[PDB]
Design a protein around this nucleic acid. Sequence first.
RNA 1: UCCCAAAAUGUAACGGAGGCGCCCAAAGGUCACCUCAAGACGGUUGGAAAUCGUCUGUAGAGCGCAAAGGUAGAAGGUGG
RNA 2: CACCCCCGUGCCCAUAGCACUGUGGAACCACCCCACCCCAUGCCGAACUGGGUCGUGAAACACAGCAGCGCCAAUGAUACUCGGACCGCAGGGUCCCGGAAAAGUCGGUCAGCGCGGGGGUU
Lengths: 175, 136, 84, 177, 104
Amino acid sequence: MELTAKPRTPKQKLDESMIAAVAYNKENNVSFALDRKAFDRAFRQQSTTGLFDITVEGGETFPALVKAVQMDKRKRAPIHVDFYMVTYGEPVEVSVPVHTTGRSQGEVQGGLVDIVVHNLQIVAPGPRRIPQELVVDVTKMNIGDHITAGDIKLPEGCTLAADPELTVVSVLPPR
Amino acid sequence: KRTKFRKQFRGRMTGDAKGGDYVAFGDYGLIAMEPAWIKSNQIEACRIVMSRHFRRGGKIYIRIFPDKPVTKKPAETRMGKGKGAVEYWVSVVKPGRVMFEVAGVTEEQAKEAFRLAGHKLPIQTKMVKREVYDEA
Amino acid sequence: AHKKGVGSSKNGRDSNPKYLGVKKFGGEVVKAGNILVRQRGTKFKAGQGVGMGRDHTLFALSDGKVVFINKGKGARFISIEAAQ
Amino acid sequence: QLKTKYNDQVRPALMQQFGYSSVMAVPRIEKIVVNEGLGSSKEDSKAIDKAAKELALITLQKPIITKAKKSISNFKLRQGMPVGIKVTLRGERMYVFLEKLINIGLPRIRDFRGINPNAFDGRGNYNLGIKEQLIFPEITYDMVDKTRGMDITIVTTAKTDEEARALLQSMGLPFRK
Amino acid sequence: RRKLRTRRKVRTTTAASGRLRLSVYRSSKHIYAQIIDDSRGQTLAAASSAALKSGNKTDTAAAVGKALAAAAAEKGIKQVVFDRGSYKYHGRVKALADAAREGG
RNA sequence: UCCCAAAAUGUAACGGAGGCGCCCAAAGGUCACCUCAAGACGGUUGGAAAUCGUCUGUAGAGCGCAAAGGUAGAAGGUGG
RNA sequence: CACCCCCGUGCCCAUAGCACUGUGGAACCACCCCACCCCAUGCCGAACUGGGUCGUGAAACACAGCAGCGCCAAUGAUACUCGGACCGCAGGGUCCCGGAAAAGUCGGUCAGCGCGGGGGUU
């Protein structure tokens, strides 16, 4: 990701395959403008829990993180991104998705398991070491098993921001 | 389908989608790419279709309910005022919007539940999967 | 007679001529008498030098210049920082 | 006629059970009330009287007809209509009648046994939903009309119900163990 | 509670007056018979009873009124206005009043 | 009186909604004073709401009628 | 404005508000005390009110910490639009040119500014 230009003007990119973001923290809110394709193949992987090499034209590598992104309607194509310059000890908080594995003891029973809340957010992530994922139990879950925040194993340190008793995944019944 | 109680009438105007997310309530989804008035009955014509195709699961979401009453010609004349509050109920749907999005069933096993449904809609759509992470 | 309701229900005939708004704008040299605002409730609270008719109207007690003070909405005022 | 032991038994025994940084903190009694929510089922521009006159003679005060909330619910309801009655007691009259209870009221009660515990107004305030007025040192069936009842309010400066119960019974109060 | 003061205070027009307002904090036995000038939040005279009292606190009633009215003299104020507070124009406070309502 | 009416006013239609042909010795003038709806916990006929009580409680109430604007430092609620 | 704190009263009037926590007492304040009558609660001197300690600081208040909730709130891109010029049978839409949100985010704060009176720097 070698974003280079960064002017209020985007003509020289609005046609030429390039997105256009902004990365900051509170110190520097450098103007920006990276390439479409790159961040296009990029963000896909790391998602909002994936800091990357930000050597803007001239050479000034910066560590940040995909904060929010605004893509086009009609066209599932993205248009504007906001990068949040990585910190050191604390960033803010991060948006972390819930995942299953192992067959569920509900699935074959006759019902299905529903991940009520896809991605989940947790208080204090801890920069440098931020879960770029989160795998969760489901097996135990039978006909009406609800798992919540207070349940999902944590990655040692991380503190769950969302309310505990909130249902994360529930193996729904048939029909 | 039809709402429970309200005022009785309306109007008409348009411009691209506003509060039609993307991912949520499932993994796969369907998207309306064109201005139209989705007829409540044109939804059953969709739900009931997707249903068949899914012996079970239910994991079908219709986040487009019809908040609108259109009217009709009480035969012809023209000497009288507003008419036919009960012609039918509509659900104005703008581009990018999401009427459908299943969940759980295999890709193709979903790339059909829509295909079909599509066939009863007045507009041109397309199916979608993820990377949708604005507000939560 | 018959056995129904007098006139036909659910109509739509007629309404009202209706007015209101603002008569004097910020910067205008009000005068003795002139009216500054015809409002319904208390959209604009009579500030300094500004009388208020029975109908939440606003008139000029003295002469001077019209001025506008709006504190975070909710309460507004017209004062007269006279020229003299 | 009391207040001494009031402190004495209450206050002292309270730091002498508890430990308050002051005597102003310790729980106390703000006032004792009596609502006479008669009428409604009985619309008697006559019965109302049986209330006040009587109530009056027991609480030594002239109560206020806590008229209708202007509520005209499905049933027999309406605007402001003389429905209930309030006779609030504080300090003297509070204590004066209060005592009557810890002494004759409940003590002099047929089929009496004490009073349920259970924390009421978490507010440290206690509630007392008296019934048959037949147990009063002032109630006289042999010089009245018919026969009714009533509810009394315990207003206490107690912050906690824990503390209340203490004061409560200390001052005097029968509990059904 | 504060309503009372705001209700009194507010009804007491300000500049349209041009006059002045005399307060009082006789809620406590530390009245302050303060006098103020509409526009600028400036306090002109004011004659409390803080400079001792001789043991009179709910009594120096007139002391402060009499102290006050005479007070503005070394300033010269003919038209003032009573801006009491909760103090429903009773006695202890009607004091300062009458006392001042003539000490001037 | 609301919407249409296209953020000044004004603007039609056998366009969409709803009221008036009064009422008040006081529901006025003035001077005082109080302040709501509602839920929760606890309490007698009560037991759904409502009477009392205690917390929360910018008002989610009120304003004689239709609606809107307006309003608690009251135009809300009592008395002289 | 010598340093401070306390009371009253403004400007301002939620970035100045809440809550949770601590500080203060005999200068001030408050509770508290009694209250027959001045005057008073459609019952209650609870509140208004009159005459005053001790005791307290518990409550009310004032200060102070804190931000978990409120309130404030970027930048970037955007919605939309004056003007200019185009497309689609129609629903609707685009380009150039200024204007440009709202929401969200970065972050911001638990004010600041006066007048006067009291008490202190044993």
